[PDB]
Design an enzyme around this catalytic site. Structure first.
Site, PDB file in Angstrom:
ATOM      1  N   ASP A  54       0.830  -1.201   0.000  1.00 46.86           N
ATOM      2  CA  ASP A  54       0.000   0.000   0.000  1.00 46.86           C
ATOM      3  C   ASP A  54       0.869   1.257   0.000  1.00 46.86           C
ATOM      4  OD1 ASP A  54      -2.585   1.510   0.458  1.00 46.86           O
ATOM      5  OD2 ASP A  54      -1.622   1.966   2.375  1.00 46.86           O
TER       6      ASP A  54
HETATM    7 MG   LIG Z   1      -4.649   0.533  -0.295  1.00 46.59          MG
END
Ligand SMILES: [Mg+2]
Ligand SMILES: [Mg+2]
Lengths: 119, 124
Positions: B19
């Site tokens: 992420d």
């Molecule tokens: Mg994400």
């Protein structure tokens, strides 16, 4: 594409914030901590209040170019910190963002190592 | 040093790292045009959400090396009804961040650039 050529304080901070998060995440994501704890440890090093001390902890030694970047960077009351801390925090992210762009990705590892030698 | 991607790495741990890796790359590419904060942020959020990463995953998954296909799969299969997307999309979003996270840990940063290139190539 030079340093202050086309990059402003906030634009540099934008990049630096993401860089900083990646490093803090990489470091704590190796102790097998569980999601809830993993978030607590990272969140304690990603906030501006802490980012500030990291700045006041290295600003007086960093290269000139970087000292200037941070300087102007310290120029909407902050939620959980002093106006003074939020600015230095930006100064920190702005500087990191700069080092990264200048490929000077070594002065960064030296700043991260200071963050690990504390928690 | 760390351990193998399977040695003791959950798909949730990789997706966590992935992420952050994804944001960085996206902000980088958009931070070169000169947009203002509001606009810059708008373009970033557009390719940083679960719905988008999901399109990415579904467009690459079939062409990724075996080692990655595995990570992606185990990562898909939450008891947390997603907001802006569906269960399937959210999962594929995690699977995508899991693969990205893995490639990094395996010094395969060149494999990441190829995926990032299909993010902006389909943008111009
Ligand atoms: Mg994400
Ligand atoms: Mg930040």
């Amino acid at each position: 594409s030079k340093d202050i050529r086309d990059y402003s304080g906030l634009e540099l901070a934008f990049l630096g914030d993401a860089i900083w998060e990646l490093e803090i995440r990489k470091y704590y994501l190796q102790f097998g901590y569980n999601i809830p704890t993993l978030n607590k440890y990272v969140k304690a090093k990603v906030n501006a209040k802490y980012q500030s001390l990291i700045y006041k902890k290295i600003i007086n030694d960093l290269d000139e170019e970087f000292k200037v970047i941070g300087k102007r960077a310290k120029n909407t009351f902050p939620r959980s910190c002093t106006v003074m801390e939020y600015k230095e925090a930006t100064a920190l992210e702005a500087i990191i963002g700069a080092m990264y762009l200048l490929k000077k990705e070594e002065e960064i590892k030296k700043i991260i190592n200071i963050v690990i030698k504390g928690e």
